[PDB]
Amino acid sequence: NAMRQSGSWMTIWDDRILEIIHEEGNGSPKELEDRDEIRISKSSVSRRLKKLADHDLLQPLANGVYVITEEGEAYLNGEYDAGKERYIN
Amino acid sequence: NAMRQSGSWMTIWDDRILEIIHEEGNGSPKELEDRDEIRISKSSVSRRLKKLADHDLLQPLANGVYVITEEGEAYLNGEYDAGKERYI
């Protein structure tokens, strides 16, 4: 409900990727690439996925599948500051 | 309610900026840069504002102040394609 607290390292496609994985459950480069809402390349998506995972907004599972974390969820809901990297209360 | 359809030229701060202006009803570099949600500089905010207005997502008023447009609202609601620049 509160506004997202984004980090200075984020791009707009980060929010899109997080939103898509939140709704679909999991994501992978090829299938994210094919979304209308994603206007970056499959390799860029891979780069953003790796980045989101480094920041613990996503986590990598077997076979190049990525899935959202609690922090990723809290972030979408304005409850996690992705810049300072702490929950907000 | 549908997902936002962003353009290749946008940054994350554009959404944050549009969202804030949507809530408060206006925006200027100074007041925006003071929001905690905004992690870019005043000069940087000033440029994002100009670009959002260039793309008709904000209307610029005198004295460096901006308000959101219908197209800006539609964009936030997932009804406007900010890349091809057309309603959906």
- Sequence spans of domains, chain B: 1-88
Give alpha helix (H) positions in chain B: 12-24, 29-33, 42-54, 70-76
Instruction: Give the span between the Cα atoms of B73 and B59, in whole angstroms.
Output: 12
> Between A13, A14, A37, which is nearest B5 by CB?
A37
For residue B44 the two structure tokens come to 């940087």
- Residue B41's CB: how many other CB atoms inside 10 A? 11
- Residue B65's CB: how many other CB atoms inside 10 A? 17
Experimental technique used to determine this entry: X-ray
The whole-angstrom distance between B14's CA and the closest CA on chain A is 8
Does the beta-carbon distance from A5 to B36 stay under 8 Å? yes
Torsion of CA B22, A57, A86, B75, to 10 degrees: 0
For residue A16, list chain B residues with Cβ-Cβ distance below 8 A: 3-4, 6
Instruction: Give the span between the Cα atoms of A11 and A23, in whole angstroms.
Output: 19
Q: State whether CATH 1.10.10.10 applies to domain A1-89.
A: yes
Residue of B nearest to A37 (CA): B5
- Please, what sign has the CA dihedral across residues A5, B57, B51, B5? positive
B33 lies within 8 A of chain A by CB: no
Q: State whether CATH 1.10.10.10 applies to domain B1-88.
A: yes
The whole-angstrom distance between A15's CA and the closest CA on chain B is 8
> What's the resolution in A?
2.1
The whole-angstrom distance between A20's CA and the closest CA on chain B is 9
Instruction: Give the span between the Cα atoms of B78 and B86, in whole angstroms.
Output: 11
Instruction: Give the span between the Cα atoms of A27 and A21, in whole angstroms.
Output: 5
The angle subtended at Cα B6 by Cα B44 and Cα A74, nearest 5°, is 80
From the CA atom positions of chain B, what is the Rg in Å? 12
Instruction: Give the span between the Cα atoms of B81 and B88, in whole angstroms.
Output: 7
Q: Which residue has the tokens 């670009």?
A: B51
DSSP letters spanning A30-89: HHHHTSTT--S-HHHHHHHHHHHHHTTSEEEEGGGEEEE-HHHHHHHTT-EETTTTEE--
A3 lies within 8 A of chain B by CB: yes
